[PDB]
Write a structure and sequence with these properties.
Two copies of one chain form a homodimer.
Chain A lengths: L8 E4 L4 E7 L10 E6 L6 E5 L3 E2 L7 E6 L2 E7 L7 E9 L4 E4 L3 E5 L2
Parallel strand pairs in A: 1-10
Antiparallel strand pairs in A: 2-7, 3-4, 3-8, 4-5, 6-7, 8-9, 8-10
The complex binds the ligand CN1/C(=C/C=C/c2cc[n+](CCCS(=O)(=O)O)c3ccccc23)C(C)(C)c2ccccc21 and chloride ion (2 copies).
Chain lengths: ~110, ~110
C-alpha cells in the first residue's frame, strides 16, 4: 500500500478554493523534496510541482504547492471542470531508502 | 493569517466520506492537544473533538479525530445535511507561547 497518505476522493464546485493533503512522516515529506503530478484517466502524467513548492512550466497558475512539517499540500485556487483528475504526491524516504508515493486523490468537480 | 493549514472548502454528497486536514508544526500540532469545533452561521459553535482524538459527549459516531507527525485530521464518515458547517482546528503553540488556529474548512453538502 502507498506509504504517503492521500484521501482517495475530494469534491468541489467550480470556483471553490480546495486544498488537498499529502500526509507523510519524518523520514519522507519532512526531510525531502515533495513532487506532485496530475494524471487524467489513461493519460501520461504531468508533473505540477517539484522541490516542494516550485510550479512546473505548462501548469495553470491556480495550482500551488507547499509543506507544513510532515505534511505537503496542493492548493487549487478556483476549481475548474478541467481539474477533474487524479493527483499524486511523492518523495524520497530516508528510512525505506527509496521512493514513496501517495495513493492519489481523485478530484471531482460537481455542479 | 492562520498558523494551522486547512483547505478553505470542500463539497460532498450525502453519505460520502470527507476528511478535514489541519497541518502544523513540531511546536503546535505535533506535541500539543488538538481541538476541533464546528461552526454554523449565527450559531453557538460545538467542540467535537478534544485531546486529539476524543469525541465530545453526544457527537455523532461518524466524526473521528486523529493526528500523526505535525498534521491532524477530522474524518466525517457519511455526510449529512446537518454537517454543512465550518470546521476549525486549534492547539497551543509552544514556540509562540499562544493559541494557534486553522482558517476553517467550509463543508458544503450538495444534493
Ligand atoms: C525523482 N522523481 C521525479 C523528479 C521530477 C523532477 C522535475 C520535474 C519537473 N520539472 C519541471 C521541468 C519543466 S520546467 O518547469 O523546468 O520548464 C523539474 C524541473 C527541474 C528539476 C526537476 C524537475 C519524478 C519524475 C516526479 C518522479 C516520478 C517517480 C519517481 C521519482 C520521481
Ligand atoms: Cl485531501
Ligand atoms: Cl481541510
Amino acid at each position: 500500500q502507498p506509504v504517503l497518505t492521500q484521501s482517495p476522493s475530494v469534491s468541489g464546485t467550480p470556483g471553490q478554493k480546495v486544498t488537498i493533503f499529502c500526509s507523510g512522516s519524518s523520514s519522507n515529506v519532512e526531510d525531502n523534496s515533495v513532487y506532485w503530478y496530475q494524471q487524467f484517466p489513461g493519460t501520461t502524467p504531468k508533473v505540477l510541482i517539484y522541490n516542494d513548492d516550485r510550479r512546473s512550466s505548462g501548469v495553470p497558475d491556480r495550482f500551488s504547492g507547499s509543506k507544513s512539517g510532515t505534511s505537503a499540500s496542493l492548493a487549487i485556487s478556483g476549481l475548474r471542470s478541467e481539474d477533474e483528475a487524479d493527483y499524486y504526491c511523492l518523495s524520497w524516504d530516508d528510512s525505506l531508502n527509496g521512493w514513496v508515493f501517495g495513493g492519489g486523490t481523485k478530484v471531482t468537480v460537481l455542479d
